[model samples]
Target: PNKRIFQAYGNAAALFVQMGAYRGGPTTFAVVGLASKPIHVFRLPWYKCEWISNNGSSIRAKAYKMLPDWGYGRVYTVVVVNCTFPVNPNQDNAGGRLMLNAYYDESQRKYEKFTALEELPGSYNESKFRPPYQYEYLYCGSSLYGNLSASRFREWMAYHAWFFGPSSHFVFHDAGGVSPEVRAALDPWVRAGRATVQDIRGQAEFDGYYYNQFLVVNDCLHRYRYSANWTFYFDVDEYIYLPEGNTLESVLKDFSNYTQFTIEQNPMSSALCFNDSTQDYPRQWGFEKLLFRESRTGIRRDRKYAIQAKNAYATGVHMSENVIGKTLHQTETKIRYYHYHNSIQVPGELCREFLPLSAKNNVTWYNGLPYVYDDNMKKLASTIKDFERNTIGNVQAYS
Candidate 1:
């Protein structure tokens, strides 16, 4: 009994599971789930496809739905990988094994399960999004959409771990599905109750996808007001490299007459000087060196404001505009949001965090400085970390 269980969430869950065979042969899979009354099962026939790439690889698997129309609200999953996978590594040496390896992002999932975050039902509440529970500072960030690979997860998380510290509670929103590798990488942090990955796919727009990220952010603010003492909005790629890593508790004390304000509102939101690095994928110094020391243009895009919990917002990015705060008189060196533009291969101050020259978005892809920095700060830079990393290690799609 190769039994494995997965959480069944949302209406009509997905069914895209991936499997692998080094010997290259056929395999079979059956997904089973049970609930109070309803039982759902699916059979998957396996086949392999070959291809070559200048830099090559890539599935989407279904999630089980164990909801009984009349019973209750709970689900469970159990999968069977037979013939193809060795149930017992020692018991059977002649057979093979196939673990689910998602095809980066281009690969597909079970059609229905391949749905986007913007395709889910609207209206979500604070009840389902709590941190399981924390207080003081509940750091929140929303991914407009992230279909990222698993390898980069470690590096991305390291940045968060360093910047936020253990004092703050974290609530991050993910649009679509993340592969098992990503889930595994984050399991430790999640298990310890330090983080909560909110799946907004079910609440996504069904027809017209909503692109205004501020909307998702705004919702988080409303929910955050329920219990959290304070909340902050920052990007996954962006880091709050406090003045010498000062504590947020100490930072809050600096503001006596203000409730919501940015420390050094938007300081140094540009790329690192050099373009390459030594540390490989999923590894690197969490901190990226900043160039602009004082009075630099376009430095305000890094503004990440923290506010009293429960404040209502018409929009997220600019809530600090109306929120009252004291104007700083001296050079206190408040806070810094080190914007590491796509610097996948580059280490520290040398990584290239700017968009690709031919990146359509990068204006200057492979070299040179970024053409323009949108002050609104909504767009993101693409990275070659996944492509470069895939070339080396166990990137072959299996699951």
Candidate 2:
């Protein structure tokens, strides 16, 4: 019976799960089988799982139909874990929903609808089954074990197979971790049965974590092979704005040739002070910071700080590091990112807790300017402008 069940749902199975500290030691697995072959494509739906306290975690899962062309011929499932603090309805409700909106539209554009999994039918609240303590969080907290064990969460997912057939792929979000070994291990298990893996790594100087873009570039080169896979790095506050008409999928359709690409990040300067009271306002209220045109001859105003390479066949050198080799595709499609500046303030205790390690390393200056408190404060104050007069555009309000 077990063998039959395994055979029924195995093969080309794509498991989308996230692992982390409170969620079962960075190495936990959950398997959901598909019963029907999925449509050509699908998009994974995700929601922010809020933590009731600082130490809490929340996870959500969904199974998907199959995609045949990708060679994922059997049933599959996709899972998502919310890694951050519980969804702060006040701070993230709008932004979170907007992100989901964009993600869904993008998925449709890819021609995939087999991304979302049906919520387990029949509502039997938590108290009924009384899952073991280890799996208790799956019902309430954001741990994989909890959701996996929730009221036949796995079994009910399988029940669909008899009716739908199977799904082709699985996907996940916030598969958070710091070390390469941890990430590498999780990659195989979650995507072990899939044709490819798509990794998105980003989050700098926030939540006591910082995976600098430079390091991510190097990590990709050192770890995975450059083939038809895709790895994107960007923070939540930053969006990769392609050329007016080109989507990310359209630009990098052929993943074999391009190893790296340069993106133009136009920094948005703000003037508001960082405080809990003003958390809802834009970080910057005034525009006193200077904006310069891109120039290579002088300061190289828009110098290439990061590179996106694909079709990695050999290990490549990144900023002096011999890393994974990827094909470089220079595109006319410009990518833009928004840098949020005023979002860093927290209570004194939280502030100190979240400071980056680099701040303690004594390397606190750029271009002879200190990055510490006083120096930064002075620079920030001097840059404050209520309005600016330009002969070409007349006087414009900076605040």
Candidate 3:
């Protein structure tokens, strides 16, 4: 468990998202947080620190800006400072305090002193540094906010839990979006040791993009760096899909050498549903009912991806441009995700009204184009429901 002590680090222009002190890798120490403005990636300020012990010593560290602002930053961007330190379980006589010094500019003429003393993250014995990590798949979701749907969220949770199997864990950041209903949907998973919902409503103070999700994801990346072999970044509305005849393990094994791989999107309508005579409209999940997909070709769509967490220094919402090793982009056939854009905000029934295949001209259209009646997701909804029934002990629980 980590503590949050958000205090102003003097009169510095940069703000701290998290003054993290953890061993992300064999020789890595990281501090990630929001900055008032963007800083150079190549030239960053050298930070100073002291271990706060009778035998404590001072160490010099350097900073690196984490992830691109991507024209989303209103006033702040996320950053990280990485350095090396000895691995020790003993916190000094003063109870493991580290007074850190950081600067806003590359000149390093002036410094912003961390007014609040930060304690080093407590360590344990027997392979804390090395791994066989705790988890194989770690889902790092963007900040959950807005009028998000609980049923849709529940459907996603159940499916992905089964998709990634037992050794997977999910981390969701709350940006005042985890309403009571949303919390109710998530509480079961949290209690079952499958997920962790972080309260990041405090992030409102920093005017970062989309509730500082860009900052939150990178913070998750470094914080859980050594805990998982692969880390995923995507939205709750999006569902990761391995096409027919493809299994998760085999697909991952085929691309294991790559540091990151981007999954192409099959954009689906947020409101349109097929007028199926045999389907139970009210009982079906969002994915079960909304069956129309955009079939237009060569129209560039944004992608989501999974990263080898250990090899990634920083990450963004769609992808991590700043990563080590090769990235595989031609993964459309190998793996993909269904993007139900703007569907999470719809509080009412996702399937507002049914549309006939002949009524494409009159019904709601996507991106000024007609939709293709693709039932791939709709076909899998029953399997996900069965999974929820077996795992959660109730079929009608989420609905």
Best by TM-score: 3
Better of 1 and 3 by lDDT: 3
The true-versus-predicted C-alpha distance at residue 11 of model 2, in Å, is 48
Score every model by TM-score.
0.46, 0.26, 0.85
State model 3's lDDT: 0.72
Query: What digit string (tens of lDDT, one per residue) describes model 1 on residues 1-399?
Result: 788888877755333321111221112222211111224522333222221111222122222221111223323121221222322221222222223321212244532222111101232233433444356667776643544444345545544554455555677676663556666655655655756788766544421322235445545654555446567776655555555555755666766445676644433333432223543412433333223222345454445666764333223453443233443333247655555444333333333453323333333322333343332221111122232243222223221
Candidate 2 wrongly placed segments (more than 4 Å): 1-228, 254-256, 270-310, 313-333, 341-399
> Which residue pairs in candidate 3 collide?
17-33, 17-34
Write the residue-wise lDDT of candidate 3 on 1-399 in tens digits: 499888866654444545355556433456666555544532254455444443455444343445344634355556655554555413333444444576555654666676223444444333745677889989997877787788777878988998888899999988888999888888778877889998878766654333376677777888788778889988889988888988988898899899899999998888887677886677777777777887777889998989998897777778887788999998988798999988898868777777876654444465577886777887787787778777775634533
Assess each prediction's global lDDT (C-alpha) against the native: 0.41, 0.26, 0.72
| Candidate 2: clashing residue pairs, number | 50
The predicted structure with the larger TM-score, 2 or 3, is: 3
Model 3 misplaced stretches (Cα beyond 4 Å): 1-19, 38-46, 49-54, 71-73, 85-99, 104-110, 115-122, 208-211, 276-278, 357-367, 395-399
Model 1 residue runs over 4 Å out of place are: 1-133, 149-152, 203-209, 263-283, 286-302, 311-314, 318-332, 342-399
lDDT ranking from best candidate downward: 3, 1, 2
Question: How far off is model 2, as Cα RMSD?
Answer: 23.2
Clashes found in each candidate (C-alpha, N, C closer than 3 A) = 33, 50, 2
lDDT of 2 by residue, 1-399 (tens): 456543365434222222111221111111111122235554343222222212233233221222111223223222222232222322211211111111232254432222221112232133321222211000000111111111111112122111111221222222242134323423332332421223343322122222223223333331322211333433322223444555444555643344455455444322212234433322222211111111123232232323322222111112212224542424423444333333212111212112233443343433333333212212332222211112111112111
